[PDB]
Design a protein around this ligand. Structure first.
Ligand SMILES: [Mg+2]
Ligand SMILES: [Mg+2]
Ligand SMILES: [Mg+2]
Ligand SMILES: [Mg+2]
Ligand SMILES: [Mg+2]
Lengths: 336, 107, 156, 109, 51, 58
RNA sequence: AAGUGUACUGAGUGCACUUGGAC
RNA sequence: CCCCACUAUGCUUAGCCCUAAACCUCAACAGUUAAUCAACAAAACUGCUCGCCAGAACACUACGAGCCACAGCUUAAAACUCAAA
RNA sequence: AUAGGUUUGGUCCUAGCCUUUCUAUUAGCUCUUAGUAAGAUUACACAUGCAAGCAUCCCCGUUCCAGUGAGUUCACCCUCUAAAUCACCAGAUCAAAAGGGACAAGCAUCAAGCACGCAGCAAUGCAGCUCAAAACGCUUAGCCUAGCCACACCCCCACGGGAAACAGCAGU
């Protein structure tokens, strides 16, 4: 709303670079936010996404294209690209595309969310031949550099985000800084999985066992237990080290919201290699679920009251395949 | 090659041996799925009994049933060992007569 | 510093001719470099450098003499390509000559340092050891190396 | 004498002088190929302490093991520059030589 | 004792080397006299024709 | 002599020679010019090789 | 006649190349 | 396929792409003619060095990567099959 | 290899595959005795019984033996020098930690690692160090067998937590 009433007026007077966090998948509100002008979608943090199957980059580009179609002209979106400011992947190709065509003339407004990496991308582009070093001007004082001037707008804060609840250290831990390694676990009905102390899943009413592949920060503990012991373990180990997020023990947990419940029913199990659904706990991560053929499973996801739990089509449907072998009686699969 | 080239390239890197039809094991267990006949490549023509069986590793394979007479039926347990048949292209396994549901050759 | 010989300079064959200065100025002009081609200029430059540097300019098969001649040739090729910027054959010849001069300089450095230093000073050749690795500098490698250098500087 | 380093004396070639008072010396040992039975020049890198910084790239040096490793890698001291690069003195006749030709003839004195 | 004998043998071989170098130098000077005569003859003809 | 380092030097000096560096820091220079390979072997054996007595003791 | 490379068209054609063809 | 007209293109400039039966299908260097040798081809070999091959097809292919700046080239597999090629 | 069969209408060459030999596991069918040797597929879970006592009390041992091969260049040599035995000391013996050297296989469609070095008493400076002679990284495997290395349910460790632990014997 603040962006609508302060910055949209300036923007609607040119090119817009809309940055979207690939892991987290504001889009439908763009027509009012920016108006009818040229827009380019940049899927950030691609390096942190595991390569579930060949052509996953193409699949992601496609998925972004249908998302935009759901929300827009293909405001007009003229290009969808995948970039990683941290690794400088695709930045030079983006620069070449920007400079290669007539359509990209005028100023550039870099719009996106707080965690999208706008700061990293702005620094990367500033440290490049694209810019003709940086200045600060009031729009709110914001950074800019000549190219016509590049404009870095304030990040749009995300509502119902676990990062808002988490502290600086907790947010740092939760946010993956290295490439994510999927962690698969074979679960039978009546079992519970704990992604830190933030996310929990209860699998039940399943005609057959299934596989759950957690895609999250490598340093976020994943704990498997029975439904009976799931609670008692939760109270005992809230915070502390077994569930490293949050931190502060009972002191922090007193202020931490309790985990509200949300029921889920999974569609027919599409084999044992194609995920049926990704259950995302806001920005912390997600879990891809593969039931067995024809099997329908009942789930209950417990997520902090303030934040929300989202069931989405699998972002990496073939992520179950990348794995090793079962270790002991433990449900865990050796990570490849 | 020259002596220097041989030294640089080291000893030959013998390729790993490809896993046979039985995935390196002399025998496996399986569940029959569908029995049928097959025609051997010419000049051999006599019909040969084959059965699709799901091994202990999930894989399904066609396995030749040797001898005359049997009772193998759907969802019946058999033991299958390696060994391609002379004149049944593709068939690369054999049910071991005298184990589990494979009542001895019904002579 | 590679100033060319003055045009009036007589050819090598005639600089030793007795009474050459005691003849017509027109004869001197005709015998001079002005009325000669670039090969004569290169030969005179080679003579100049030889007398300047090598201990025994009379020896022409010495390694120092070979290096001097090859350096003269390289200068010639550089001047030629300053104009015929599109001559791939002479570009190749220049690159090969540079490589050969580097090889001869290496040999001289390993054999007679006392004279290698004199060659280098005389011809203004800053000898540089070959790079250890030739790994291609592609976009990703360049960008990541720059980022790592900046990171190290920040840590320092 | 009772040095804790393995190789007491090693002759190598200086291949780097970008370290204060320390010279990067390359040492090559003939090694029997167990199969061909031919000998090849296996090479290892050693760091020699050179207080006087008299090492020049290309010199052939003799390195003596230090009593103890004085750094993470410096385990030898330059005992003697065996062949100063391009300034070789024939040890036999003691006269300077340039490759295979004497500068000062041995009959000079 | 062995090292002393080695040095003695080195001295002996050094004397032999010096003798060889003396003889070779004599022969080289004798031959280079003719070589220098040839060079002078060539130079004189060159200078004469050029003049 | 697996542990005795051996290194070669082609065309470094006008005359050929060997040089042994001992554990005591001593340097033994052996002239090989004009000698046959067998003669060189015998000389080095005499001046630095273990005698058959020592070998038999080992 | 065959084929290599390359490009258009829907097997041919265009350019160069080879004889692994005949005179 | 034949005839007619005409365009890319063949041409100049300035940049790109890097593939050909890019073949004398016979790698560089040195050497020899001593006793011939699968066959054909350009008589047979010796020394020395570098590069390359380890059945066929899958396959100048897929995946990844590089060059691209997106329709392509280079690198280059695996599984399954056969007792051939 | 002392080789053999197999491509074709036929011959020669190149090339793969298969046969012959000796082992080991499993299976079919079959089987008398005696001595000896060896003996879960599973680092999957375990019912049950037992496997650490001795001894005038203190001590000492239960850290060994025994087991497994999950992991994995912690194994070998040299230097130095702990602990232990020599009723005490002795140096001797034994052998830790630490330093130096050595030390498996495949993959380059794993090509760069990203601080991987040095000088200085220190501040601090120098900007270096490894790598196509394979660094870095992924996958596989106990090994070099009088025996050796590693693990001891897992979290590499084990304060702590997960949870109630036969990879000790017999057994399920
Ligand atoms: Mg035209
Ligand atoms: Mg049996
Ligand atoms: Mg443990
Ligand atoms: Mg156990
Ligand atoms: Mg037991």
């Amino acid at each position: 709303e603040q962006y609508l009433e302060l910055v949209s007026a300036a923007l609607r007077r040119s090119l817009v670079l809309y940055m979207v966090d690939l892991l987290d998948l504001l889009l439908p509100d763009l027509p009012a936010l920016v108006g009818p002008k040229q827009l380019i979608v940049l899927g950030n943090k691609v390096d942190l996404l595991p390569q579930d199957a060949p052509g996953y980059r193409q699949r992601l580009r496609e998925r972004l294209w249908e998302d935009c179609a759901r929300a827009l002209l293909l405001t007009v979106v003229r290009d969808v690209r995948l970039i990683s400011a941290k690794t400088g992947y695709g930045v030079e190709e983006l620069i070449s595309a920007l400079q290669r065509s007539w359509r990209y003339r005028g100023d550039v407004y870099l719009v996106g969310a707080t965690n999208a990496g706008k700061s990293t991308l702005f620094n990367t582009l500033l440290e490049s031949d694209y810019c003709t070093r940086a200045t600060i001007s009031p729009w709110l004082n914001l950074l800019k550099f000549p190219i016509h001037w590049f404009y870095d707008t304030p990040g749009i804060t995300k509502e119902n985000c676990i990062l808002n609840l988490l502290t600086e250290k907790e947010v740092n831990i939760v946010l993956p800084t290295q490439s994510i390694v999927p962690r698969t676990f074979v679960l039978k009905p009546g079992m519970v999985l704990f992604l830190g102390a933030i996310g929990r899943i209860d699998f039940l009413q399943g005609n057959q066992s299934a596989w759950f592949t957690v895609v999250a920060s490598n340093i976020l503990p994943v704990h498997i237990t029975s439904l009976d012991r799931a609670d008692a373990l939760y109270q005992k180990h809230a915070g502390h080290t077994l569930l490293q997020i949050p931190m502060g023990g009972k002191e922090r947990m007193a202020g931490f919201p309790p985990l509200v419940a949300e029921d889920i029913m999974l569609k027919e199990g599409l084999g044992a290699s194609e995920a049926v659904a990704d259950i995302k706990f806001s920005s912390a991560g997600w879990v891809s679920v593969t039931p067995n053929f024809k099997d329908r499973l009942h789930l209950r996801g417990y997520t902090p009251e303030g934040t929300v739990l989202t069931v989405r089509p699998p972002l990496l449907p073939y992520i179950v395949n990348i794995k090793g072998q079962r270790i002991k009686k433990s449900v865990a699969y050796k990570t490849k | 090659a020259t002596l220097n080239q041989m030294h640089r390239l080291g000893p030959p890197k013998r390729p790993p041996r490809k896993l046979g039809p039985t995935e390196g094991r002399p025998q496996l267990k399986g569940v029959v799925l569908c029995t049928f006949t097959r025609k051997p490549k010419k000049p051999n023509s006599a019909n040969r009994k084959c059965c699709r069986v799901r091994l202990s590793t999930g894989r399904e394979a066609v396995c030749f049933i040797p001898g005359e007479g049997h009772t193998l039926q759907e969802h019946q347990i058999v033991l299958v060992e390696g060994g391609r048949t002379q004149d049944l292209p593709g068939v690369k396994l054999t049910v071991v007569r005298g184990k589990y549901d494979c009542g001895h050759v019904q002579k | 510093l590679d100033d060319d010989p003055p045009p009036s300079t007589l050819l090598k064959d005639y600089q030793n001719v007795p009474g050459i200065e005691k003849v017509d100025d027109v004869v001197k002009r005709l015998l001079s470099l002005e009325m000669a081609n670039k090969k004569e200029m290169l030969k005179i430059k080679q003579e100049q450098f030889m007398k300047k540097i090598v201990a025994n300019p009379e020896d022409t098969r010495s390694l120092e003499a070979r290096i001097i001649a090859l350096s003269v040739k390289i200068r010639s090729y550089e001047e030629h390509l300053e104009k015929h910027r599109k001559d791939k054959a002479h570009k190749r010849y220049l690159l090969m000559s540079i490589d050969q001069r580097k090889k001869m300089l290496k040999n001289l450095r390993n054999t007679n340092y006392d004279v290698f230093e004199k060659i280098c000073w005389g011809l203004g050749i800053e000898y540089t050891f070959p790079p250890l690795y030739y790994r291609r500098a592609h976009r990703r490698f360049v960008t990541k190396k720059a980022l790592c250098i900046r990171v190290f500087q920040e840590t320092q | 004498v009772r040095s804790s380093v393995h190789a007491r004396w090693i002759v190598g070639k200086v291949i780097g002088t970008k370290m204060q008072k320390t010279a990067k010396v390359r040492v090559t040992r003939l090694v029997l190929d167990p199969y061909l039975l031919k000998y090849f020049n296996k090479r290892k890198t050693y760091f020699a302490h050179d207080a006087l910084q008299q090492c020049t790239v290309g010199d052939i040096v003799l390195l003596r093991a230090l009593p103890v490793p004085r750094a993470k890698h410096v385990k030898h001291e330059l005992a003697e520059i065996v062949f100063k690069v391009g300034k070789v003195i024939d040890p036999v006749t003691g006269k300077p030589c340039a490759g295979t030709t004497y500068l000062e003839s041995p009959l000079s004195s | 004792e062995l090292m002393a004998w080695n040095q003695a043998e080195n001295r002996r071989l050094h004397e032999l080397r010096i003798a060889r170098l003396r003889q070779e130098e004599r022969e080289q000077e004798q031959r280079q006299a003719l070589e220098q005569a040839r060079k002078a003859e060539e130079v004189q003809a060159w200078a004469q024709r050029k003049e | 002599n697996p542990w005795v380092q051996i290194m070669m030097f082609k065309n470094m000096t006008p005359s050929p020679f060997l040089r042994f560096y001992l554990d005591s820091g001593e340097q033994v220079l052996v002239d090989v010019e004009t000698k046959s390979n067998k003669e060189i072997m015998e000389h080095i054996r005499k001046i630095l090789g273990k005698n058959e007595e020592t070998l038999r003791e080992e």
